[PDB]
Amino acid sequence: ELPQMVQQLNSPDQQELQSALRKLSQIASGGDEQIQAVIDAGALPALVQLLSSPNEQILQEALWTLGNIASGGDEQIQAVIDAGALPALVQLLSSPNEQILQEALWTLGNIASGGDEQIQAVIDAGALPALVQLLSSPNEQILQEALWTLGNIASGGDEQIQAVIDAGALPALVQLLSSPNEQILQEALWTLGNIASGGDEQIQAVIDAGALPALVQLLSSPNEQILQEALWTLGNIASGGNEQKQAVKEAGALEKLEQLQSHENEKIQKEAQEALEKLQS
């Protein structure tokens, strides 16, 4: 079974290569134990090589297989990294084929769902400037994939947060707080919340980027999920130092937060209360 399949990934007969590729992709879309069988069979170097196939269908299906491998456990994500997939994945971020572009983004997002070391490998492969550019894609699906991927990177340690800030992501993220698309809006809030879960100077960069007026407004959102994400991100900002806290107060937050203490949702009441007590000493 799997050793023959892997051999055929190098076959000059394209029907063999594709037949082997479709069976491996099937297997890699199962559980982690199946993913491991594929990795242990030695499929990764050849799958990485197929990221240069001039055949677009083959390229895309190799990409989908890697993305599935990368939805596995952190050691499975690390094998993808150790097989040298990141440089090609980053190049693919400038593919004019939007289905290929999307699958590269999805795969990088999966890799960035790993541990902080896996996230750092994504940063070190130079993914950030392209991800930041993709935040102004006219394609909503592309934009959402880039956003998801950035949010994942921003969910790592403070050094990972710092690279996102350093790559210039903040102004784009704050602009997306005007998005009329509710999913985009939610994921931008969530990404800013993750940045604002860092150090006080990382909180200050969010403030400096102009996020507070939209955050405070969104405490009155009719979508409870949006309200909650705004309130979480704001509560993170309010956990900063005195200069951070003073800026929250001057943005008008005390009045909305008090209003929230009578909200029917207990998580909202409690979050608002925590926020207020931080802000008031």
Author numbering: 12 to 292
Which sentences from the paper describe this structure?
The armadillo repeat serves as a scaffold for the development of modular peptide-recognition modules. In order to develop such a system, three crystal structures of designed armadillo-repeat proteins with third-generation N-caps (YIII-type), four or five internal repeats (M-type) and second-generation C-caps (AII-type) were determined at 1.8 Å (His-YIIIM4AII), 2.0 Å (His-YIIIM5AII) and 1.95 Å (YIIIM5AII) resolution and compared with those of variants with third-generation C-caps. All constructs are full consensus designs in which the internal repeats have exactly the same sequence, and hence identical conformations of the internal repeats are expected.
The structure of YIIIM5AII without His tag was determined in the absence of calcium ions and refined at 1.95 Å resolution. This structure is most similar to chains C/D of His-YIIIM5AII (r.m.s.d.s of 1.14 and 0.60 Å for Cα atoms of residues 14–288 of chains A/B and C/D, respectively). A superposition of YIIIM5AII on His-YIIIM5AII based on the N-cap and internal repeats M1–M3 (residues 14–168) reveals that this part is very similar in all chains. However, in this superposition the C-terminal repeats of YIIIM5AII match nicely with the C-terminal repeats of His-YIIIM5AII chains C/D, but they are shifted towards M3 in chains A/B (1.4 Å shift of Trp201 CA towards Leu158 CA). However, in YIIIM5AII the spread between Trp33 Cα-atom distances is extremely large, with the largest distance observed between repeats M3 and M4 (the distances between Trp159 CA and Trp201 CA are 9.42 Å in chain A and 9.43 Å in chain B). This distance is probably too large for binding the target peptide in the desired conformation and this mismatch is located almost at the centre of the putative peptide-binding site. Although YIIIM5AII is considered to be a full consensus design regarding the sequence of internal repeats, the internal repeats are not identical in terms of structure. In the more stable YIIIM5AII structure the side chains of Leu16, Leu20 and Val7 adopt a uniform distribution of side-chain rotamers in all repeats.
